[PDB]
Design an enzyme around this catalytic site. Structure first.
Site, mmCIF file in Angstrom:
data_model
loop_
_atom_site.group_PDB
_atom_site.id
_atom_site.type_symbol
_atom_site.label_atom_id
_atom_site.label_comp_id
_atom_site.label_asym_id
_atom_site.label_seq_id
_atom_site.Cartn_x
_atom_site.Cartn_y
_atom_site.Cartn_z
ATOM 1 N N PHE A 102 -47.003 59.608 108.979
ATOM 2 C CA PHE A 102 -48.463 59.638 109.057
ATOM 3 C C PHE A 102 -49.126 59.790 107.707
ATOM 4 O O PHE A 102 -50.319 59.513 107.609
ATOM 5 C CB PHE A 102 -48.913 60.776 109.978
ATOM 6 C CG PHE A 102 -48.370 60.653 111.383
ATOM 7 C CD1 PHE A 102 -48.852 59.636 112.231
ATOM 8 C CD2 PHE A 102 -47.283 61.446 111.800
ATOM 9 C CE1 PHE A 102 -48.260 59.439 113.464
ATOM 10 C CE2 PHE A 102 -46.728 61.254 113.056
ATOM 11 C CZ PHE A 102 -47.211 60.247 113.880
ATOM 12 N N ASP A 129 -43.645 71.440 116.356
ATOM 13 C CA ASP A 129 -42.858 70.733 115.398
ATOM 14 C C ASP A 129 -42.293 71.758 114.452
ATOM 15 O O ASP A 129 -42.341 71.559 113.257
ATOM 16 C CB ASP A 129 -43.619 69.579 114.687
ATOM 17 C CG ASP A 129 -42.753 68.488 114.024
ATOM 18 O OD1 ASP A 129 -41.590 68.304 114.435
ATOM 19 O OD2 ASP A 129 -43.313 67.747 113.194
#
Ligand SMILES: CC1(C)CC[C@H](Nc2ncc(C(F)(F)F)c(-c3c[nH]c4c(P(C)(C)=O)c(C#N)ccc34)n2)CN1
EC number: 2.7.11.22
Lengths: 274, 291, 65
Positions: free
Chosen positions: B14, B122
């Site tokens: 990203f 995460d």
């Protein structure tokens, strides 16, 4: 959480005199730049009208857009026009960018194409509007000061209803308040109150407005359940805060159709020059 | 902007990350430059919306964001190191005190985060950034999400809890707790505890190493939407896995690897465990190993 | 140099929020949706939803700008 939020810290203003000031400032500061014209009340009439427009957009959005997106969008539009003129950034466009950003921030995953599929235009208009939305999305975010989480009154509202059902059988079924307290949250939303008081205060004022509108005085909820017998000044600080909100929904007058038509013509003109 | 771009720190899905300096302070920053008719990328808006609402020493601070059009640059403090690099440093000894300190900060960050009704989703050793004063910060809030209102794909596989692997939509802090469990196991074993190549093979190694669950262990396991029955493994006794671990740490690890994510210790419950209050002090941030 | 669990003493400017484990005991969970078996097996409970709703109701109720 609200109590340590950027909303509390930066976006709940000490009074309407501080609101009027930030707006009247930004109208002047527009004029100072534009000379290097709507009067502040006329910007306000238009921002009222375009917050209505934002509400209509969000209400018909074809993937059913959550109240927490719609409330976040409406909050972005209130915060934008505290510090920016409707004569620099056209409220029509900024309203879409409000809804757009709010869809993204509230995790209501809807792609750009079906976002603008909701706009009541041709596909050329939808593409052009999408392009304008993407032009202003960082502008919006800079002007929101990167304070993107909006604490809406709706979750506080759920908690008070849970709390009332549990702890306050004086109000036998609290859920009977829901409709008129929602109607009152909707009325509070049109006012400056979102910028002036907390989500819980708005939620509770809406509850106590519906309570009062049913003739069910919930004073013992405040004093006894909320424990403000212990601190009666906190009880009156609370009552004062709620009084003043009911006065805000009272003093609010909608922008008139015939009036907004003149101000719109002026607005269009301010945008077509320069 | 007011930023000098010094060093490419890396790039992933990203964003590209650069070590950068503001032309305004001595303080080095890490700018995460986010990549592309969607508008500003949701993983950037995810970090902006969350890190502006979190103020904790053990969560990464968003310093600034800037950009143009649909591109954006999130500015954060630069963290000299991360837990992955500490774990992977073969010539760096993880004393129990180091492990306790890392765990403590991780759990304090998580406690704050879970109090603010957010899951990191995460956690893995590289998302546990260390500043040069040895404060561990949770970082990479790009998958982080509010809970108490999701998707199974989250958490990199070796840290992904079995309820995630069985396709759990809804979950709470246990996905972070299992990931803390995994990070703890890797602070101990110095390698991935469960390095499984697939959702199937991650469930296999889970059930191989820890034993297959039962409905005595995990009451409604079978109702998870990507459930399939594994063969009964015995598991490897946690003292045969973690033979350096004391009974207090095994009690921690046990509660961190409890199959029921409900029973699995919360960051608060984990912090109140006797492991943290026991005699080896959790090392001061100043004295944690810089890799 | 030992640790001792001290809770976060974040000021909420609101009523006392009833602790998560007490919500069933205190009868708040009679007024929220039961987490289904898939919810439960994922580790999601009715208590999480309840606790957050009550937390939000109370947060900043007494706070004046
Ligand atoms: C190699 C070390 C241990 C020493 C430099 C680095 N210092 C640092 N300081 C702050 C941030 C933060 F958090 F502020 F951005 C980040 C960061 C966070 N996400 C990153 C990524 P990704 C693409 C996985 O998001 C990559 C990649 N590849 C690279 C860096 C970061 N890193 C951390 N790693």
């Amino acid at each position: 959480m609200y109590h340590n939020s950027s909303q509390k810290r930066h976006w709940t203003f000490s009074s309407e005199e501080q609101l009027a000031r930030l707006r009247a400032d930004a109208n002047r500061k527009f004029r100072c730049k534009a000379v290097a014209f709507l009067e502040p009340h006329e910007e306000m009439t238009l921002c009222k009208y375009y917050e209505k427009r934002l509400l209509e957009f969000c209400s018909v959005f074809k993937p059913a857009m959550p109240r927490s997106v719609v409330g976040t969008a409406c909050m972005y539009f209130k915060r934008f026009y505290l510090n920016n003129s409707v004569m620099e950034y056209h409220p029509r466009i900024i309203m879409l960018t409000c809804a757009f950003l709010a869809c993204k921030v509230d995790e209501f995953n809807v792609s750009s194409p079906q976002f603008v599929g909701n706009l009541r235009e041709s596909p050329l208009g939808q593409e052009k509007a999408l392009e304008q939305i993407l032009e202003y999305e960082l502008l919006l975010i800079q002007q929101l000061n990167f304070h993107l989480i909006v604490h809406n009154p709706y979750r506080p509202f759920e908690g008070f209803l849970i709390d009332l059902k549990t702890r306050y059988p004086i109000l036998e079924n609290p859920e009977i308040l829901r409709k008129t307290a929602d109607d009152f949250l909707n009325r509070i939303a049109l006012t400056d109150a979102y910028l002036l008081y907390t989500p819980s205060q708005i939620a509770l004022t809406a509850i106590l407005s519906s309570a009062s509108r049913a003739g069910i005085t919930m004073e013992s909820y405040l004093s006894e359940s909320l424990m403000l017998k212990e601190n009666r000044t906190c009880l009156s600080q609370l009552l004062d805060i709620m009084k003043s909100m009911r006065n805000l929904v009272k003093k609010y007058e909608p922008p008139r159709s015939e009036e907004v038509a003149v101000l719109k013509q002026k607005l269009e003109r301010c945008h077509s020059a320069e | 902007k007011r930023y000098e771009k010094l060093d490419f720190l890396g790039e992933g899905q990203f964003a590209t990350v650069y070590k950068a300096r503001d032309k305004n302070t001595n303080q080095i920053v890490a700018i995460k430059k986010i990549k592309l008719k969607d508008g500003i990328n949701r993983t950037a808006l995810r970090e902006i919306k969350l890190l502006q609402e979190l103020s904790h020493p053990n969560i990464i601070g968003l310093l600034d964001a800037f950009g143009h059009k649909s591109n954006i640059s999130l500015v954060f403090d630069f963290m000299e190191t991360d837990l992955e690099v500490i774990i992977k440093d073969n010539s760096l000894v993880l004393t129990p005190s180091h492990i306790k300190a890392y765990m403590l900060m991780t759990l304090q960050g998580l406690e704050y985060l879970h109090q603010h009704w957010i899951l990191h989703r995460d956690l893995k050793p590289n998302n546990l950034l260390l500043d040069e004063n040895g404060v561990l910060k949770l970082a990479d809030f790009g998958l982080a999400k509010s809970f108490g209102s999701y998707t199974h794909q989250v958490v990199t596989r070796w840290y992904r809890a079995p309820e995630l692997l069985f396709g759990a939509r809804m979950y709470g802090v246990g996905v972070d707790m299992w990931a803390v469990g995994c990070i703890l196991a890797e602070l101990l074993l110095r390698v991935p505890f469960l390095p499984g190549d697939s959702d199937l093979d991650q469930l296999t190694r889970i059930f191989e190493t820890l034993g297959t669950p039962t409905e005595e262990q995990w009451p409604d396991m079978c109702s998870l939407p990507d459930y399939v029955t594994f063969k009964s493994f015995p598991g490897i006794p946690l003292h045969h896995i973690f033979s350096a671990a004391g009974d207090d740490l095994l009690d921690l690890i046990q509660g961190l690897f409890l199959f029921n994510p409900c029973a699995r210790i919360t960051a608060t419950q984990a912090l109140k465990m006797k492991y943290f209050s026991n005699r080896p002090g959790p090392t001061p941030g100043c004295q944690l190993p810089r890799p | 140099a030992l640790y001792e669990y001290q809770p976060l003493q974040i000021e909420t400017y609101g009523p006392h929020v009833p602790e998560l484990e007490m919500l069933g005991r205190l009868g708040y969970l009679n007024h929220v949706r039961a987490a289904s078996p898939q919810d439960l097996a994922g580790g999601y409970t009715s208590s999480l939803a309840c606790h957050r709703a009550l937390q939000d109701a109370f947060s900043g109720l007494f706070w004046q700008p």
